[PDB]
Amino acid sequence: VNSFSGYLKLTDNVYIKNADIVEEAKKVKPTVVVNAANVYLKHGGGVAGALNKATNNAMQVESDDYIATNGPLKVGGSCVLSGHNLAKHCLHVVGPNVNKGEDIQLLKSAYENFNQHEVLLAPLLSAGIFGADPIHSLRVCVDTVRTNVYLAVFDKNLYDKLVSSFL
Ligand SMILES: Cc1ccc(C[C@@H](CO)Nc2ncnc3[nH]ccc23)cc1
Ligand SMILES: [Cl-]
């Protein structure tokens, strides 16, 4: 039993809800919140910009030190950093950004990072400003993640299409 509330159950382990991941994380304070990161951990917009704003830019400060030490992530890769005031940990995961021409096949590799954590609050990878079809992203999530994932979809219209079109 966990403290996630109001989710629709899609499969044994995947759940989905219309919610602002920022507000969800503050309420639940999950062990792991997933960020829709880029390889440079520059959290300028989208989910990443919103999560960083909620940390008063502490996420960005920590991220800049991470990059200065380790260099950029790989597309499809991840790193674990602090969750600041939002969660215990933040798993920064880089899905392909279609608006950069990045290979959509890497979306499965991106979701594989979730399997290293028993329970996660997450957005749909490569959705929003990363340019991929959120319906496809949900399919890859369900077919790749085996741990317990709570998917937060900010847009109410998009959420209804995801559910009503889910197979
Ligand atoms: C119309 C539309 C907008 C955005 C998306 C992508 C989605 C991640 O896939 N973004 C988010 N998901 C959950 N909480 C969030 N808080 C801030 C951003 C955000 C798809 C479609
Ligand atoms: Cl977005």
JSON list of C-alpha atoms and ligand atoms in Angstrom, two decimals:
[
{"chain": "A", "resi": 1, "resn": "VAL", "atom": "CA", "xyz": [0.00, 0.00, 0.00]},
{"chain": "A", "resi": 2, "resn": "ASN", "atom": "CA", "xyz": [1.23, 3.48, -0.95]},
{"chain": "A", "resi": 3, "resn": "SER", "atom": "CA", "xyz": [-0.12, 7.04, -0.68]},
{"chain": "A", "resi": 4, "resn": "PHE", "atom": "CA", "xyz": [-0.92, 7.61, -4.38]},
{"chain": "A", "resi": 5, "resn": "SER", "atom": "CA", "xyz": [-4.56, 8.61, -4.86]},
{"chain": "A", "resi": 6, "resn": "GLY", "atom": "CA", "xyz": [-7.03, 8.89, -7.72]},
{"chain": "A", "resi": 7, "resn": "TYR", "atom": "CA", "xyz": [-5.15, 6.85, -10.33]},
{"chain": "A", "resi": 8, "resn": "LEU", "atom": "CA", "xyz": [-6.70, 4.63, -12.99]},
{"chain": "A", "resi": 9, "resn": "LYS", "atom": "CA", "xyz": [-5.09, 1.17, -13.12]},
{"chain": "A", "resi": 10, "resn": "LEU", "atom": "CA", "xyz": [-3.96, 0.29, -16.64]},
{"chain": "A", "resi": 11, "resn": "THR", "atom": "CA", "xyz": [-2.05, -2.93, -15.86]},
{"chain": "A", "resi": 12, "resn": "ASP", "atom": "CA", "xyz": [-0.67, -4.82, -12.87]},
{"chain": "A", "resi": 13, "resn": "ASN", "atom": "CA", "xyz": [1.97, -2.13, -12.26]},
{"chain": "A", "resi": 14, "resn": "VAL", "atom": "CA", "xyz": [1.11, 0.95, -14.39]},
{"chain": "A", "resi": 15, "resn": "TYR", "atom": "CA", "xyz": [-1.32, 3.60, -13.13]},
{"chain": "A", "resi": 16, "resn": "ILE", "atom": "CA", "xyz": [-2.31, 6.94, -14.74]},
{"chain": "A", "resi": 17, "resn": "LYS", "atom": "CA", "xyz": [-3.87, 10.22, -13.56]},
{"chain": "A", "resi": 18, "resn": "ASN", "atom": "CA", "xyz": [-4.60, 13.81, -14.60]},
{"chain": "A", "resi": 19, "resn": "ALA", "atom": "CA", "xyz": [-2.38, 15.80, -12.27]},
{"chain": "A", "resi": 20, "resn": "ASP", "atom": "CA", "xyz": [0.38, 18.39, -12.14]},
{"chain": "A", "resi": 21, "resn": "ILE", "atom": "CA", "xyz": [3.48, 16.34, -11.30]},
{"chain": "A", "resi": 22, "resn": "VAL", "atom": "CA", "xyz": [4.81, 19.29, -9.30]},
{"chain": "A", "resi": 23, "resn": "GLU", "atom": "CA", "xyz": [1.73, 19.36, -7.09]},
{"chain": "A", "resi": 24, "resn": "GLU", "atom": "CA", "xyz": [1.60, 15.55, -6.96]},
{"chain": "A", "resi": 25, "resn": "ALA", "atom": "CA", "xyz": [5.21, 15.32, -5.78]},
{"chain": "A", "resi": 26, "resn": "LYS", "atom": "CA", "xyz": [4.71, 17.97, -3.10]},
{"chain": "A", "resi": 27, "resn": "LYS", "atom": "CA", "xyz": [1.65, 16.12, -1.80]},
{"chain": "A", "resi": 28, "resn": "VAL", "atom": "CA", "xyz": [2.95, 12.55, -1.96]},
{"chain": "A", "resi": 29, "resn": "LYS", "atom": "CA", "xyz": [6.67, 13.25, -1.42]},
{"chain": "A", "resi": 30, "resn": "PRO", "atom": "CA", "xyz": [7.46, 10.00, -3.25]},
{"chain": "A", "resi": 31, "resn": "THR", "atom": "CA", "xyz": [10.71, 8.12, -2.93]},
{"chain": "A", "resi": 32, "resn": "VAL", "atom": "CA", "xyz": [11.42, 8.82, -6.62]},
{"chain": "A", "resi": 33, "resn": "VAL", "atom": "CA", "xyz": [10.11, 11.52, -8.95]},
{"chain": "A", "resi": 34, "resn": "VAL", "atom": "CA", "xyz": [11.17, 11.21, -12.59]},
{"chain": "A", "resi": 35, "resn": "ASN", "atom": "CA", "xyz": [12.30, 14.31, -14.47]},
{"chain": "A", "resi": 36, "resn": "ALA", "atom": "CA", "xyz": [11.98, 14.64, -18.24]},
{"chain": "A", "resi": 37, "resn": "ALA", "atom": "CA", "xyz": [15.64, 15.64, -18.51]},
{"chain": "A", "resi": 38, "resn": "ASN", "atom": "CA", "xyz": [17.98, 16.51, -21.35]},
{"chain": "A", "resi": 39, "resn": "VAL", "atom": "CA", "xyz": [21.59, 15.35, -21.58]},
{"chain": "A", "resi": 40, "resn": "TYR", "atom": "CA", "xyz": [22.82, 18.70, -20.30]},
{"chain": "A", "resi": 41, "resn": "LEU", "atom": "CA", "xyz": [20.42, 18.71, -17.31]},
{"chain": "A", "resi": 42, "resn": "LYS", "atom": "CA", "xyz": [19.36, 22.21, -18.39]},
{"chain": "A", "resi": 43, "resn": "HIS", "atom": "CA", "xyz": [15.88, 22.38, -16.87]},
{"chain": "A", "resi": 44, "resn": "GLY", "atom": "CA", "xyz": [14.49, 25.24, -18.90]},
{"chain": "A", "resi": 45, "resn": "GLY", "atom": "CA", "xyz": [10.95, 24.24, -19.84]},
{"chain": "A", "resi": 46, "resn": "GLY", "atom": "CA", "xyz": [8.44, 21.45, -19.95]},
{"chain": "A", "resi": 47, "resn": "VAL", "atom": "CA", "xyz": [8.28, 19.15, -16.94]},
{"chain": "A", "resi": 48, "resn": "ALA", "atom": "CA", "xyz": [11.95, 19.86, -16.17]},
{"chain": "A", "resi": 49, "resn": "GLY", "atom": "CA", "xyz": [11.47, 23.62, -16.07]},
{"chain": "A", "resi": 50, "resn": "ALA", "atom": "CA", "xyz": [8.45, 23.23, -13.78]},
{"chain": "A", "resi": 51, "resn": "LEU", "atom": "CA", "xyz": [10.12, 20.81, -11.36]},
{"chain": "A", "resi": 52, "resn": "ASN", "atom": "CA", "xyz": [13.21, 22.99, -11.13]},
{"chain": "A", "resi": 53, "resn": "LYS", "atom": "CA", "xyz": [11.11, 26.11, -10.46]},
{"chain": "A", "resi": 54, "resn": "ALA", "atom": "CA", "xyz": [9.41, 24.29, -7.58]},
{"chain": "A", "resi": 55, "resn": "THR", "atom": "CA", "xyz": [12.87, 23.67, -6.03]},
{"chain": "A", "resi": 56, "resn": "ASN", "atom": "CA", "xyz": [13.72, 27.39, -6.21]},
{"chain": "A", "resi": 57, "resn": "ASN", "atom": "CA", "xyz": [16.49, 26.51, -8.76]},
{"chain": "A", "resi": 58, "resn": "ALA", "atom": "CA", "xyz": [18.25, 24.13, -6.34]},
{"chain": "A", "resi": 59, "resn": "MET", "atom": "CA", "xyz": [17.76, 21.31, -8.86]},
{"chain": "A", "resi": 60, "resn": "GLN", "atom": "CA", "xyz": [19.59, 23.35, -11.51]},
{"chain": "A", "resi": 61, "resn": "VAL", "atom": "CA", "xyz": [22.47, 24.23, -9.15]},
{"chain": "A", "resi": 62, "resn": "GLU", "atom": "CA", "xyz": [22.94, 20.57, -8.23]},
{"chain": "A", "resi": 63, "resn": "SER", "atom": "CA", "xyz": [22.65, 19.55, -11.89]},
{"chain": "A", "resi": 64, "resn": "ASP", "atom": "CA", "xyz": [25.30, 22.02, -13.03]},
{"chain": "A", "resi": 65, "resn": "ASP", "atom": "CA", "xyz": [27.76, 20.53, -10.54]},
{"chain": "A", "resi": 66, "resn": "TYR", "atom": "CA", "xyz": [26.84, 17.03, -11.75]},
{"chain": "A", "resi": 67, "resn": "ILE", "atom": "CA", "xyz": [27.56, 17.96, -15.39]},
{"chain": "A", "resi": 68, "resn": "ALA", "atom": "CA", "xyz": [30.79, 19.77, -14.51]},
{"chain": "A", "resi": 69, "resn": "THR", "atom": "CA", "xyz": [32.02, 16.56, -12.86]},
{"chain": "A", "resi": 70, "resn": "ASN", "atom": "CA", "xyz": [30.57, 13.86, -15.13]},
{"chain": "A", "resi": 71, "resn": "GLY", "atom": "CA", "xyz": [29.73, 15.39, -18.50]},
{"chain": "A", "resi": 72, "resn": "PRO", "atom": "CA", "xyz": [26.42, 14.99, -20.31]},
{"chain": "A", "resi": 73, "resn": "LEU", "atom": "CA", "xyz": [24.09, 12.05, -20.01]},
{"chain": "A", "resi": 74, "resn": "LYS", "atom": "CA", "xyz": [23.32, 9.75, -22.95]},
{"chain": "A", "resi": 75, "resn": "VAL", "atom": "CA", "xyz": [19.99, 9.91, -24.74]},
{"chain": "A", "resi": 76, "resn": "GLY", "atom": "CA", "xyz": [18.17, 6.97, -23.17]},
{"chain": "A", "resi": 77, "resn": "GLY", "atom": "CA", "xyz": [20.23, 7.33, -19.98]},
{"chain": "A", "resi": 78, "resn": "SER", "atom": "CA", "xyz": [19.63, 8.64, -16.49]},
{"chain": "A", "resi": 79, "resn": "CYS", "atom": "CA", "xyz": [21.16, 9.75, -13.23]},
{"chain": "A", "resi": 80, "resn": "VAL", "atom": "CA", "xyz": [19.88, 9.83, -9.65]},
{"chain": "A", "resi": 81, "resn": "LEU", "atom": "CA", "xyz": [20.11, 13.19, -7.88]},
{"chain": "A", "resi": 82, "resn": "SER", "atom": "CA", "xyz": [18.34, 14.78, -4.93]},
{"chain": "A", "resi": 83, "resn": "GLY", "atom": "CA", "xyz": [14.58, 15.18, -4.92]},
{"chain": "A", "resi": 84, "resn": "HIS", "atom": "CA", "xyz": [14.96, 18.44, -2.96]},
{"chain": "A", "resi": 85, "resn": "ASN", "atom": "CA", "xyz": [11.58, 19.49, -1.47]},
{"chain": "A", "resi": 86, "resn": "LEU", "atom": "CA", "xyz": [9.64, 17.29, -3.93]},
{"chain": "A", "resi": 87, "resn": "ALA", "atom": "CA", "xyz": [10.79, 13.70, -3.30]},
{"chain": "A", "resi": 88, "resn": "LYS", "atom": "CA", "xyz": [13.63, 11.78, -1.71]},
{"chain": "A", "resi": 89, "resn": "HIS", "atom": "CA", "xyz": [15.33, 11.32, -5.09]},
{"chain": "A", "resi": 90, "resn": "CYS", "atom": "CA", "xyz": [14.91, 12.64, -8.61]},
{"chain": "A", "resi": 91, "resn": "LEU", "atom": "CA", "xyz": [15.63, 10.19, -11.43]},
{"chain": "A", "resi": 92, "resn": "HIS", "atom": "CA", "xyz": [16.61, 12.41, -14.37]},
{"chain": "A", "resi": 93, "resn": "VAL", "atom": "CA", "xyz": [15.76, 10.37, -17.49]},
{"chain": "A", "resi": 94, "resn": "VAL", "atom": "CA", "xyz": [16.56, 11.48, -21.05]},
{"chain": "A", "resi": 95, "resn": "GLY", "atom": "CA", "xyz": [13.98, 10.39, -23.57]},
{"chain": "A", "resi": 96, "resn": "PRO", "atom": "CA", "xyz": [14.63, 11.21, -27.22]},
{"chain": "A", "resi": 97, "resn": "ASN", "atom": "CA", "xyz": [13.56, 14.70, -28.27]},
{"chain": "A", "resi": 98, "resn": "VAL", "atom": "CA", "xyz": [11.93, 14.33, -31.69]},
{"chain": "A", "resi": 99, "resn": "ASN", "atom": "CA", "xyz": [12.27, 18.08, -32.23]},
{"chain": "A", "resi": 100, "resn": "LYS", "atom": "CA", "xyz": [16.04, 17.44, -32.23]},
{"chain": "A", "resi": 101, "resn": "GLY", "atom": "CA", "xyz": [15.85, 14.47, -34.62]},
{"chain": "A", "resi": 102, "resn": "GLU", "atom": "CA", "xyz": [16.67, 11.87, -31.97]},
{"chain": "A", "resi": 103, "resn": "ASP", "atom": "CA", "xyz": [15.86, 8.20, -32.54]},
{"chain": "A", "resi": 104, "resn": "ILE", "atom": "CA", "xyz": [12.48, 7.27, -31.06]},
{"chain": "A", "resi": 105, "resn": "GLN", "atom": "CA", "xyz": [13.67, 3.68, -30.49]},
{"chain": "A", "resi": 106, "resn": "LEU", "atom": "CA", "xyz": [15.72, 5.05, -27.58]},
{"chain": "A", "resi": 107, "resn": "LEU", "atom": "CA", "xyz": [12.41, 5.60, -25.76]},
{"chain": "A", "resi": 108, "resn": "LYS", "atom": "CA", "xyz": [12.43, 1.97, -24.63]},
{"chain": "A", "resi": 109, "resn": "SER", "atom": "CA", "xyz": [15.98, 2.36, -23.29]},
{"chain": "A", "resi": 110, "resn": "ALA", "atom": "CA", "xyz": [14.85, 5.49, -21.42]},
{"chain": "A", "resi": 111, "resn": "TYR", "atom": "CA", "xyz": [11.97, 3.64, -19.73]},
{"chain": "A", "resi": 112, "resn": "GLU", "atom": "CA", "xyz": [14.29, 0.75, -18.76]},
{"chain": "A", "resi": 113, "resn": "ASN", "atom": "CA", "xyz": [15.85, 3.11, -16.20]},
{"chain": "A", "resi": 114, "resn": "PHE", "atom": "CA", "xyz": [12.57, 2.98, -14.25]},
{"chain": "A", "resi": 115, "resn": "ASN", "atom": "CA", "xyz": [13.13, -0.73, -13.51]},
{"chain": "A", "resi": 116, "resn": "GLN", "atom": "CA", "xyz": [15.92, 0.16, -11.07]},
{"chain": "A", "resi": 117, "resn": "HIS", "atom": "CA", "xyz": [13.32, 1.66, -8.69]},
{"chain": "A", "resi": 118, "resn": "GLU", "atom": "CA", "xyz": [10.46, -0.21, -7.03]},
{"chain": "A", "resi": 119, "resn": "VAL", "atom": "CA", "xyz": [7.98, 2.72, -7.17]},
{"chain": "A", "resi": 120, "resn": "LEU", "atom": "CA", "xyz": [8.10, 5.98, -9.15]},
{"chain": "A", "resi": 121, "resn": "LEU", "atom": "CA", "xyz": [6.04, 9.07, -9.89]},
{"chain": "A", "resi": 122, "resn": "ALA", "atom": "CA", "xyz": [6.70, 9.99, -13.51]},
{"chain": "A", "resi": 123, "resn": "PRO", "atom": "CA", "xyz": [5.56, 11.88, -16.59]},
{"chain": "A", "resi": 124, "resn": "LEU", "atom": "CA", "xyz": [5.29, 10.29, -20.02]},
{"chain": "A", "resi": 125, "resn": "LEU", "atom": "CA", "xyz": [8.78, 10.26, -21.52]},
{"chain": "A", "resi": 126, "resn": "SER", "atom": "CA", "xyz": [9.36, 12.20, -24.74]},
{"chain": "A", "resi": 127, "resn": "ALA", "atom": "CA", "xyz": [5.86, 13.71, -24.50]},
{"chain": "A", "resi": 128, "resn": "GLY", "atom": "CA", "xyz": [5.16, 17.44, -24.41]},
{"chain": "A", "resi": 129, "resn": "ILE", "atom": "CA", "xyz": [7.98, 19.53, -25.90]},
{"chain": "A", "resi": 130, "resn": "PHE", "atom": "CA", "xyz": [10.07, 16.43, -26.68]},
{"chain": "A", "resi": 131, "resn": "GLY", "atom": "CA", "xyz": [7.73, 15.91, -29.63]},
{"chain": "A", "resi": 132, "resn": "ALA", "atom": "CA", "xyz": [6.74, 12.24, -29.37]},
{"chain": "A", "resi": 133, "resn": "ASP", "atom": "CA", "xyz": [3.19, 10.88, -29.46]},
{"chain": "A", "resi": 134, "resn": "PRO", "atom": "CA", "xyz": [2.06, 10.49, -25.81]},
{"chain": "A", "resi": 135, "resn": "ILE", "atom": "CA", "xyz": [-0.08, 7.48, -26.81]},
{"chain": "A", "resi": 136, "resn": "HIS", "atom": "CA", "xyz": [3.02, 5.70, -28.13]},
{"chain": "A", "resi": 137, "resn": "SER", "atom": "CA", "xyz": [5.01, 6.70, -25.05]},
{"chain": "A", "resi": 138, "resn": "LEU", "atom": "CA", "xyz": [2.34, 5.12, -22.84]},
{"chain": "A", "resi": 139, "resn": "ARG", "atom": "CA", "xyz": [2.50, 1.90, -24.86]},
{"chain": "A", "resi": 140, "resn": "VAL", "atom": "CA", "xyz": [6.29, 1.71, -24.49]},
{"chain": "A", "resi": 141, "resn": "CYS", "atom": "CA", "xyz": [5.97, 2.45, -20.76]},
{"chain": "A", "resi": 142, "resn": "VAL", "atom": "CA", "xyz": [3.49, -0.39, -20.22]},
{"chain": "A", "resi": 143, "resn": "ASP", "atom": "CA", "xyz": [5.57, -2.82, -22.30]},
{"chain": "A", "resi": 144, "resn": "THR", "atom": "CA", "xyz": [8.92, -1.89, -20.67]},
{"chain": "A", "resi": 145, "resn": "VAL", "atom": "CA", "xyz": [8.46, -0.86, -17.04]},
{"chain": "A", "resi": 146, "resn": "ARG", "atom": "CA", "xyz": [7.94, -3.75, -14.63]},
{"chain": "A", "resi": 147, "resn": "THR", "atom": "CA", "xyz": [8.14, -1.77, -11.38]},
{"chain": "A", "resi": 148, "resn": "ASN", "atom": "CA", "xyz": [5.23, 0.28, -10.03]},
{"chain": "A", "resi": 149, "resn": "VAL", "atom": "CA", "xyz": [4.82, 3.50, -11.99]},
{"chain": "A", "resi": 150, "resn": "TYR", "atom": "CA", "xyz": [2.34, 6.30, -11.34]},
{"chain": "A", "resi": 151, "resn": "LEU", "atom": "CA", "xyz": [2.03, 8.38, -14.52]},
{"chain": "A", "resi": 152, "resn": "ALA", "atom": "CA", "xyz": [0.99, 12.02, -14.13]},
{"chain": "A", "resi": 153, "resn": "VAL", "atom": "CA", "xyz": [-0.55, 13.69, -17.18]},
{"chain": "A", "resi": 154, "resn": "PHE", "atom": "CA", "xyz": [-0.87, 17.47, -16.80]},
{"chain": "A", "resi": 155, "resn": "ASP", "atom": "CA", "xyz": [-3.29, 18.01, -19.70]},
{"chain": "A", "resi": 156, "resn": "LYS", "atom": "CA", "xyz": [-6.83, 16.82, -18.97]},
{"chain": "A", "resi": 157, "resn": "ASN", "atom": "CA", "xyz": [-7.77, 16.52, -22.64]},
{"chain": "A", "resi": 158, "resn": "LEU", "atom": "CA", "xyz": [-4.68, 14.41, -23.32]},
{"chain": "A", "resi": 159, "resn": "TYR", "atom": "CA", "xyz": [-5.38, 12.16, -20.33]},
{"chain": "A", "resi": 160, "resn": "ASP", "atom": "CA", "xyz": [-8.86, 11.23, -21.59]},
{"chain": "A", "resi": 161, "resn": "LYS", "atom": "CA", "xyz": [-7.47, 10.34, -25.03]},
{"chain": "A", "resi": 162, "resn": "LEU", "atom": "CA", "xyz": [-4.79, 8.15, -23.43]},
{"chain": "A", "resi": 163, "resn": "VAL", "atom": "CA", "xyz": [-7.32, 6.20, -21.37]},
{"chain": "A", "resi": 164, "resn": "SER", "atom": "CA", "xyz": [-10.03, 5.94, -24.03]},
{"chain": "A", "resi": 165, "resn": "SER", "atom": "CA", "xyz": [-7.43, 4.79, -26.57]},
{"chain": "A", "resi": 166, "resn": "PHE", "atom": "CA", "xyz": [-5.52, 2.43, -24.27]},
{"chain": "A", "resi": 167, "resn": "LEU", "atom": "CA", "xyz": [-5.36, -1.21, -25.33]},
{"chain": "B", "resi": 1, "resn": "LIG", "atom": "C1", "xyz": [-0.63, 19.57, -24.06]},
{"chain": "B", "resi": 1, "resn": "LIG", "atom": "C2", "xyz": [0.55, 18.78, -23.48]},
{"chain": "B", "resi": 1, "resn": "LIG", "atom": "C3", "xyz": [1.42, 19.36, -22.53]},
{"chain": "B", "resi": 1, "resn": "LIG", "atom": "C4", "xyz": [2.52, 18.64, -22.00]},
{"chain": "B", "resi": 1, "resn": "LIG", "atom": "C5", "xyz": [2.78, 17.30, -22.38]},
{"chain": "B", "resi": 1, "resn": "LIG", "atom": "C6", "xyz": [3.98, 16.46, -21.82]},
{"chain": "B", "resi": 1, "resn": "LIG", "atom": "C7", "xyz": [3.98, 16.08, -20.30]},
{"chain": "B", "resi": 1, "resn": "LIG", "atom": "C8", "xyz": [5.11, 15.01, -20.09]},
{"chain": "B", "resi": 1, "resn": "LIG", "atom": "O1", "xyz": [4.91, 13.96, -20.97]},
{"chain": "B", "resi": 1, "resn": "LIG", "atom": "N1", "xyz": [4.18, 17.25, -19.43]},
{"chain": "B", "resi": 1, "resn": "LIG", "atom": "C9", "xyz": [3.88, 17.32, -18.07]},
{"chain": "B", "resi": 1, "resn": "LIG", "atom": "N2", "xyz": [3.33, 16.22, -17.45]},
{"chain": "B", "resi": 1, "resn": "LIG", "atom": "C10", "xyz": [3.03, 16.27, -16.12]},
{"chain": "B", "resi": 1, "resn": "LIG", "atom": "N3", "xyz": [3.22, 17.29, -15.27]},
{"chain": "B", "resi": 1, "resn": "LIG", "atom": "C11", "xyz": [3.78, 18.35, -15.94]},
{"chain": "B", "resi": 1, "resn": "LIG", "atom": "N4", "xyz": [4.05, 19.53, -15.19]},
{"chain": "B", "resi": 1, "resn": "LIG", "atom": "C12", "xyz": [4.61, 20.43, -16.16]},
{"chain": "B", "resi": 1, "resn": "LIG", "atom": "C13", "xyz": [4.67, 19.82, -17.39]},
{"chain": "B", "resi": 1, "resn": "LIG", "atom": "C14", "xyz": [4.14, 18.49, -17.28]},
{"chain": "B", "resi": 1, "resn": "LIG", "atom": "C15", "xyz": [1.90, 16.73, -23.33]},
{"chain": "B", "resi": 1, "resn": "LIG", "atom": "C16", "xyz": [0.81, 17.45, -23.86]},
{"chain": "B", "resi": 2, "resn": "CL", "atom": "CL", "xyz": [6.13, 19.19, -21.56]}
]
